[PDB]
């Protein structure tokens, strides 16, 4: 998609805008002999709030075959807890401290 | 004569006893030690305290070794290219000064 | 003797430079234990004899 | 009997993992899990490749 400034300044109130946002973390280093880029890459639209809220895991790739890439996200522990049914039969996460 | 011989008579004798004259491979065929501090190949240490003898230093053949290698091809294909720019006027060029 | 020179010469000028070939990372559970002692996480598909 | 419920097997949940891949990243090495460990762990590994 391609959002003109005019469209963000004239979209009707209550219409849902649909914006796209790069996660450019999975972007490989430039070739050492690739030509220099004379001009700049500029950007105008930014979120006001966190966007990646549904995100669970990020950048499932190695960095130097051990080190994690900066900004990669392992799943939260709760995704994997599978605790137990409670005395009444409610679901529960496993105990943290033993007691 | 049999100087190239490594193993001889790979068959049983009474399902345990070795045939007389059968030859197991020498231990060095299987050492795969390590690279030295400078990167030479070496057999593993014999006694715990002594350092390992370099494989080139002794006459034994050894069939496992640590070879360094690139993980993928060196020739990525991004060959270097340049912006040659000529002198503006040939008369003005400074041949002088070394 | 002529032949020895060619070994020497041919070895004097070996310019081969190894790149990793196809590899394999068996799970430890699929390897009989001695092989697991000998293997080091992964190996070239073309292990030769030893 | 009244059809008060809806018998089903291998239930589908309310939330599911969606995943976007960058398809130029693949490990040169190839894992070789046992067939049963692949029957178990497999849909996961295929999803989080």
């Amino acid at each position: 998609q391609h959002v003109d400034a005019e469209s963000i300044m004239t979209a009707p109130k209550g219409k849902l805008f649909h914006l796209q946002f790069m996660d450019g973390l999975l972007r490989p280093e430039p070739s050492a002999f690739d030509p220099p880029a004379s001009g700049e890459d500029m950007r105008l639209i930014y979120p006001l709030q966190p966007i990646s809220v549904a995100r669970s895991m990020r950048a499932i790739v190695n960095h130097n075959e051990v080190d994690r890439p900066r900004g990669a996200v392992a799943p939260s522990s709760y995704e994997m807890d599978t605790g137990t049914l409670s005395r009444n039969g409610d679901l529960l996460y496993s105990p943290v401290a033993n007691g | 004569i049999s100087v190239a011989r490594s193993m001889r008579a790979i068959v049983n004798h009474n399902e345990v006893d070795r045939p007389r004259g059968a030859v197991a491979p020498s231990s060095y065929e299987m050492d795969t030690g390590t690279l030295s501090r400078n990167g030479d190949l070496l057999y593993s240490p014999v006694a715990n305290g002594q350092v390992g003898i370099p494989k080139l230093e002794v006459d034994h053949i050894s069939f496992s070794n640590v070879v360094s290698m690139m993980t993928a091809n060196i020739r990525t294909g991004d060959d270097m290219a340049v912006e040659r720019v000529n002198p503006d006027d040939v008369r003005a060029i400074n041949i002088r000064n070394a | 003797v002529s032949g020895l020179l060619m070994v020497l010469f041919k070895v004097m000028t070996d310019n081969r430079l190894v790149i990793v070939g196809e590899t394999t990372t068996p799970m430890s559970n699929t390897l009989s234990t001695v092989v697991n002692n000998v293997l080091r996480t992964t190996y070239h598909n073309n292990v030769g004899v030893n | 009997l009244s059809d008060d419920f809806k018998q089903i097997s291998d239930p589908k949940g309310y939330l599911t993992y969606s995943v976007k891949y960058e398809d130029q990243f693949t490990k040169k090495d190839k894992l070789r899990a046992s067939e049963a460990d692949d029957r178990i762990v497999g849909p996961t590994v295929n999803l989080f490749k």
């Binding site: 490989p28 950048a59 | 091809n73 | 081969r16 004899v49 | 990243f25």
Partner: peptide, 26 residues
């Protein structure tokens, strides 16, 4: 049924290095 000798020697499998376009890390 007559006995027979035979022989073998380990083959070369030295391919020239492959050109993968895929990359393995960031």
């Amino acid at each position: 049924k007559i006995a027979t000798a035979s022989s073998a020697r380990q083959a070369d499998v030295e391919k020239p290095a492959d050109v993968t376009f895929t990359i393995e890390n960031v």
